Swiss-Prot record, chain B:
Highest taxon listed in the record's lineage: Eukaryota
Start and end residues of each stretch annotated as CH3: 115-218
Organism listed in the record: Homo sapiens
Residues of this chain annotated as glycosylated in UniProt: 71
Clinical note on disease: Multiple myeloma: A malignant tumor of plasma cells usually arising in the bone marrow and characterized by diffuse involvement of the skeletal system, hyperglobulinemia, Bence-Jones proteinuria and anemia. Complications of multiple myeloma are bone pain, hypercalcemia, renal failure and spinal cord compression. The aberrant antibodies that are produced lead to impaired humoral immunity and patients have a high prevalence of infection. Amyloidosis may develop in some patients.
Stated name of the protein: Immunoglobulin heavy constant gamma 1
Residue span relative to the full protein: 110 to 327 of 399
PTM info: Glycosylation on Asn-71 is required for interaction with Fc receptors and ability to activate the complement pathway.
Length: 186, 218
């Protein structure tokens, strides 16, 4: 079993789903038990050795409250990490002086000290999303928490102006499951 | 009432491993291609290694002693020392293992990433204006636009290495290259005292396979 994408579980915009994957007789049996009670609102994807995948749509309040989901083929149970939540520290980093010589600069967002690793980072400017950005996977730090970096690449002309860029971070331990930190030239 | 011997119904598995990226780029270390054979049946423990470098057989390998694991099985490792020039040019290395418990000999091959190299751009980033409140500040090193992913990152201060750092794995960027970050955590007192820290990056596409960028308080 595989957990849903952290944004699907922390944002009401996308529908989260728990995915059961079987790799390596094409008849298979999937029995989904949500918190003990058997549910029959799951759909199994077509097969394609062959691999059969079963998907059960979960509710945002259901997953975020840590209710357990069981896939019965083999019996596997998955849920949110039971560790004590830690609030992410969000800091923005301007491009280096040595990078200003190039035509595009890299705006850096450090998101440190959060738990669990389930998180989602996005970049936005003037209310519109940004296209050219990538974010590292969460990295286990020394104190048992997690950190990551998010790199937004914009044209230097936008940075050379007074344009304002903001780092959007979404974590379970955040107020309203959402926070922002801005970054601009001055 | 002791249970009987383990079943071990199957065959020995083999896993080939490339040399460490640091050893392949620094003249102070010896790079090795490692051929590990696991699940060696105790009834038939003899293993035979045939090393092939791009087709031509090599006979300059060393085999480490057997190691019996907690699951009562053996582990036979054979190591082949490689030349820095040969690995960096993309030479293929083939390990051929032969055992009585294997129906046909298992063969694995490892080599350097074949793409057109890209030179990394290294930038150091000082702690954020908000982070100076804490007793420890984060020193950030951005390494972007390099291919292949095999790379080595370290930190250093006053000619001595800095150990308390963490580096993210390589992340595929939009242009087919890679980027990553390395976070060095130091006491705000050391950062305020004007000490100079350095991010050292080791990549095959760099000049002399090495570069440094320093960082100090303004
Ligand atoms: C009996 O037990 C032993 C060992 O267990 C020991 O005792 C128990 C009690 C525990 O305490 C264990 O911790 C302890 O080790 C069993 O032997 C194990 O067998 C499994 C597989 O059955 C092996 O897993 C493989 O792991 C490799 C990478 O492993 C690294 O990390 C290990 C620690 O996590 C470390 O011990 C390894 O040595 C190795 O670390 C490397 O070490 C070398 C030193 O020689 C060093 O040079 C390297 O730098 C270093 N590297 C790193 C990163 O640390 C993993 O890569 C394998 O996965 C491949 O294969 C899978 C298919 O089985 C697949 O699912 C994976 O995705 C991956 O797929 C491959 O990907 C490559 C990528 O290019 C691709 O080319 C391939 O085509 C693709 N497919 C294949 C088939 O390769 C794999 O998971 C353990 O390493 C091994 N432990 C050993 C040898 O110590 C034994 O099986 C048990 N037997 C029984 C009967 O129970
Ligand atoms: C290592 C790997 O391939 N992981 C993927 C995961 O990213 C994906 O979300 C899932 C399907 O939902 O299938 C699996
Ligand atoms: O078998 C392991 C499994 O990992 C994950 C999947 O996306 C596949 O890449 C693979 O089949
Ligand atoms: K040499």
């Amino acid at each position: 079993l595989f957990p849903p994408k952290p944004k699907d579980t922390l944002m009401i915009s996308r529908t989260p789903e728990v995915t059961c994957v079987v790799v390596d007789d094409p008849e298979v049996k999937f029995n989904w038990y949500v918190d003990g009670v058997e549910v029959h609102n799951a759909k199994t994807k077509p097969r394609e050795t062959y691999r059969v995948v079963s998907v059960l749509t979960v509710l945002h309040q259901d997953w975020l409250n840590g209710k357990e989901y069981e896939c019965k083929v083999i019996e596997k149970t998955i849920s949110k990490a039971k560790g004590q939540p830690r609030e992410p520290q969000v800091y923005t980093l301007p491009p280096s002086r040595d990078e200003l010589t190039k035509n595009q600069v890299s705006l850096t967002c450090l998101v440190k000290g959060f738990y669990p690793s389930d998180i989602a980072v996005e970049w936005e400017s003037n209310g519109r999303p940004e296209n050219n950005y990538k974010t590292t996977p969460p990295v286990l730090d020394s104190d048992g928490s997690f950190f990551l970096y998010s790199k937004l690449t914009v044209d230097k002309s936008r940075w050379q102006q007074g344009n304002v860029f903001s780092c959007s971070v979404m974590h379970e331990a955040l107020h309203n499951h959402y926070t922002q930190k801005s970054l601009s030239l001055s």
